[PDB]
Design a protein around this ligand. Sequence first.
Ligand SMILES: [Zn+2]
Ligand SMILES: [Zn+2]
Ligand SMILES: [Zn+2]
Ligand SMILES: [Zn+2]
Ligand SMILES: [Zn+2]
Ligand SMILES: [Zn+2]
Ligand SMILES: [Zn+2]
Ligand SMILES: [Zn+2]
Lengths: 364, 361, 359, 359
Amino acid sequence: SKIPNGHEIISLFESMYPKHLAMEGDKIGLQIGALNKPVRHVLIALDVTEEVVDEAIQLGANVIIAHHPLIFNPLKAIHTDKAYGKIIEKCIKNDIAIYAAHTNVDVAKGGVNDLLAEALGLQNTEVLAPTYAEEMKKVVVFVPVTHAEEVRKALGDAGAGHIGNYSHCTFSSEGTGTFVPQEGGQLERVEEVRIETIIPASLQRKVIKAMVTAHPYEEVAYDVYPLDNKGETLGLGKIGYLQEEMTLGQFAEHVKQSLDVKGARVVGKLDDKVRKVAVLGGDGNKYINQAKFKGADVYVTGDMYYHVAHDAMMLGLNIVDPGHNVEKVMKQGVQKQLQEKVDAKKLNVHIHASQLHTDPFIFV
Amino acid sequence: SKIPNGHEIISLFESMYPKHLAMEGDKIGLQIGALNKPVRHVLIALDVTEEVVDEAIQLGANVIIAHHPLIFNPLKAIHTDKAYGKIIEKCIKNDIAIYAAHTNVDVAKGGVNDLLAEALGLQNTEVLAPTYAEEMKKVVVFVPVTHAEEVRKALGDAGAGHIGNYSHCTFSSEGTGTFVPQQLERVEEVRIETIIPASLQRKVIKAMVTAHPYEEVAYDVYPLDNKGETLGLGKIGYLQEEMTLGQFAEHVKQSLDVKGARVVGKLDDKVRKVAVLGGDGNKYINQAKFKGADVYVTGDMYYHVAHDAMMLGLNIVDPGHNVEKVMKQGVQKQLQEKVDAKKLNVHIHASQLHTDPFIFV
Amino acid sequence: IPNGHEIISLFESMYPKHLAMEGDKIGLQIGALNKPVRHVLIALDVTEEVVDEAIQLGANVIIAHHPLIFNPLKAIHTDKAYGKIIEKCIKNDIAIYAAHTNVDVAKGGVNDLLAEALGLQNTEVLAPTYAEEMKKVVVFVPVTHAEEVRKALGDAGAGHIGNYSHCTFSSEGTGTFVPQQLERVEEVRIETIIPASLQRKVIKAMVTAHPYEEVAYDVYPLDNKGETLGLGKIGYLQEEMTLGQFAEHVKQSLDVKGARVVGKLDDKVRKVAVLGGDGNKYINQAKFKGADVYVTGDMYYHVAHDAMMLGLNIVDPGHNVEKVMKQGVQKQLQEKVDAKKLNVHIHASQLHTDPFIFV
Amino acid sequence: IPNGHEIISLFESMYPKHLAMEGDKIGLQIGALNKPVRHVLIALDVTEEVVDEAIQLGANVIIAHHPLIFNPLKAIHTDKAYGKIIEKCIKNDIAIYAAHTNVDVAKGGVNDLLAEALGLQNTEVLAPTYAEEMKKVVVFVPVTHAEEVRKALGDAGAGHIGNYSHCTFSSEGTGTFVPQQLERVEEVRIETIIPASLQRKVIKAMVTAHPYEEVAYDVYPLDNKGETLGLGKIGYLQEEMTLGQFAEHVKQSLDVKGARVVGKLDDKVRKVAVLGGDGNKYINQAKFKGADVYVTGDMYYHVAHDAMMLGLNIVDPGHNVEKVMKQGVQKQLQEKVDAKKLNVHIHASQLHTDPFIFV
Ligand SMILES: [Zn+2]
Ligand SMILES: [Zn+2]
Ligand SMILES: [Zn+2]
Ligand SMILES: [Zn+2]
Ligand SMILES: [Zn+2]
Ligand SMILES: [Zn+2]
Ligand SMILES: [Zn+2]
Ligand SMILES: [Zn+2]
């Protein structure tokens, strides 16, 4: 086993939560410290409070992966006399790296919103509010029949032609290519195979490199066509169906047990029937129209504003607000996912899920 | 025959004047009321003044389709003591729905500008200010050899592959496909390609997929550089015979039925190529002139813009913005023709009220 | 005896307007171009002295690297030095054409000139700004004429990529059609790549050679890019030198009496980035591309400190060092005009316009 | 043994925060000030070397002319040179206080220092930025105590204008009141001018001296202005010199190895404008105020051409020439701290932080 550096770990985290998934104006990535150093232990956090930093010190963790950015507004100053400046100071003095994974963990499959849908027992889920759809490309490559099969394998293994429940999708037809080699007017002609395969733009670099390697030629002719086809839609929140119909009052209880909270606020008549549920961890005030358009009976989200809640009653949308802190499910979730990746790659790192409770609110 | 609801009528209207054609920032669509109600009479209006509302009420029209949005500036208040708030109040209290059809009516074929150009007698008209080109797509589908022939009929039956004097154009290549369901798998397939305008995309792709074996169809949609017809604001075309600027200005008054007009340019100058754009066309004097217009017909001509026109060497006849009134009988005919085809018993009316605020003296 | 229009058309084929950056002020700034033109003056800055030189030469067009009108004019004040430059251009019918960042970007431009003047080897673009679009042309042809069509396509310049020319790929298949009972024909689908700019010419040649009046062809946008152009160049000295001697080498090469240096005169230098004009924006790109030193003008204090923190050395010979573009463009434009057998003389302003004197 | 707070309070009485320009970044940038402080380091730029000097001195406060944090931090990257400066300030509990344009503006500031270093006579502010507000205080007093009240007013600093002190104007008249039938009394209306800053002190003294518990007084805003402060200084050399010798005189006076000059080395120079830092914005003001030459740093090419067109000469010794503010402020701050009998040592960074070396 090898002790990895921060960059390697981070590079394996980003395989599951890429930075292009993050939303317009979001603040993610390395925020404090450096990653070019041996990392024996990592901490997954929701909020980087001072008590969370104390925890990282008692564990020997020199990298904290947090969901909410520690620096959100850019720092005009670092006041060590203040609670906030003391967190940055504690991180800096103790060589602790702080990495933010914000909206990219909200948007990605297996992220906050999937974790909350599972927790709730929701079935047949769909993205609630689409924010990202990968641009698709058609790669067409020309290869002699001697190397055609080898080139298809390389494209496939590298992830090209992986749409739905089928992988290694390609199409090949035979034809003739012409060329006139130049200085360094003789018309040549060669029977060839035209191989085409679809790719998501993010896989372009890796797929082209594998293709070129397998290809017997040094100078390779291939085309990349942009297509109108989009990849799987990704976005904020999930909308799905409960296993059985319930009233809002008992659904609300189910949210409490299910999401481990002592209290919640509910908008709507507690005796109304609810079957399809929308959930969006964090501040989801902006998606009440989407939730209703998609047909939700109830919407589970945090930070519900008074005026937005009147807007929701007017739409005919029920709401259960278990608090923004229910996104805490992301710690144990990311901890599993990440431990799994570092174990698959023989790395000697222990990942931890912060135990500290960081909900600023107590229901009385 | 049966009585339609507002949404059915509005669908038919929108098939001729698609909403996507409106300028960014325009205010179009349902502005007041609801459309999920029976509609026996519809009134077509340019401006929704209070008398137009009295006219609908009198006809029993519970939908008014208007060219100029009743609500343009969003409402901070509804002051029923002011004339504007009285109009809104009147619509609300008599359950009249107001629907706006603004720049989409200026941009579409058969719209305001085609109507004004036809009224002026213009030949060989072209779009004055391009705003929309339909985009073409190449559709490529993979069908097993056994149903390839059917899929091509299917695609061609929905109009894909109409190139000049030929129809049902598709090209098919024999090849081999590979895939792995989650082992080495090969199928002999046919790659079929056909060209469609983007409007036919949803239709053609239904007729392809439904007529396809796997139903979990492998197909690609390529954007092409090839474009379809161009749409935009205003028309530019030619008079049947040459005339002076003064004769042409008199032609405008007769054609568009106005009592006075304002002319910029020498009345003795000869005119042959005419540009026209109903409404406020100040921003297009340059475009008019770049296209060889001897004279531009538009409304709301402003001082410094008229002086800009003189400098360019472009003559202008301003018969007023109100000449867009031609849209009332135009849309009425188009819409009554449509509703009668679908067998809906609804009467479409054109507002008989003169709404030009200006009187020439 | 040609027009300004024909002479500027030849200039633009070498320095296209689309190469220019976001809010650049290029093109005809003062005057008219539909006038007979016997002499053309190439300049960096249009100073009143440069306008006098033009008058003395009998030149009625000045092509300048720096736009005379950069900020739009709220007035033309004739008792002010600036209004007087404008005044005499007008009174002596001198047309002022601006060629700014297109000359910074294009081949043989300001940065190619500085790089070759510094003796840099294996140069690459520093900061990419343009890449020409490529398209895929696909045409359907009966077998009997496929070869004629491919030849037309290649002779016209399609499929000219890398060390190869006349590259096409043809597949045989079935085309169906119902002439105004589906008819079917064996056909050839020929595809070939083109740069966007060759489209009209290639299509025209392909159509002429096609056996039919109705030609079915498609033009696809590709993500493939043509050649990359940009700002500045990064390359290598033939031999390693200290920062101190490289700095002298810059003064000798670019003929400047002085230069300001950021970094240790004693440390070693081999890879050099250069960008004429104000290149404060690009220190990061320079360091990232591996430059041991960056030659640029107008270096600001706080940006020199940033450069230092990056571990990037600087030699600042002044922005005026772009003067190379004067004899550069003159040579390139005289070659174009002579090839077109036009009787015009292109002159490069001789006037020194660096405001700075080093003490 | 004092706090950072008490030491910074003394600094601010000399360099107030309100003097600073629009979007300036001043005040405590990193650290805390409620810590015992034995040594203070004055710096221009907070480079990693300057932080090391502080550590070596045992200084836990650095007052710098250039804000260490100018652009707000989106991150603190510890493997980057900039993040490392920030890292060690934090790890060694060094507080970084920024004193920017208030030090450019205040008396004895960067521009007073440069002017006196150049030996300029009869200096005036170049570009006005601040003028203290004046108020008129009017108080009503019975005749028997009018004189006591006026004396209180003057001893407290009211009516101190020009070469005069204790200036008041008193009028006699009738005051009416209905105590909780109008009552009337002969009274004196005393008026006097004050600077806005003396208000609390003056009012407090006036009230104490007034014979009554209820004091009727008014404070009026006036358009009268106090002393004007601003950017740069304009003044005269003791004797006329050529532009070439003035340029040497600048290198000798400001201890710089090089300078860039705009203008003819041979023409005559007498009135000089100076502005430390980046003074590109002010060439117009300099010329309008009659400067025969303008000393400033960071001169940009196109702005030198503008200067030329104005007929304004320039000597550019670099922005680093503001280093004078280091021993300047140290001297001024040591004098304040010693007067308050505080046992603190103020040190001026010895490190040379000019990134430019002239070749
Ligand atoms: Zn959150
Ligand atoms: Zn979140
Ligand atoms: Zn209109
Ligand atoms: Zn209108
Ligand atoms: Zn330049
Ligand atoms: Zn340049
Ligand atoms: Zn400064
Ligand atoms: Zn300063």
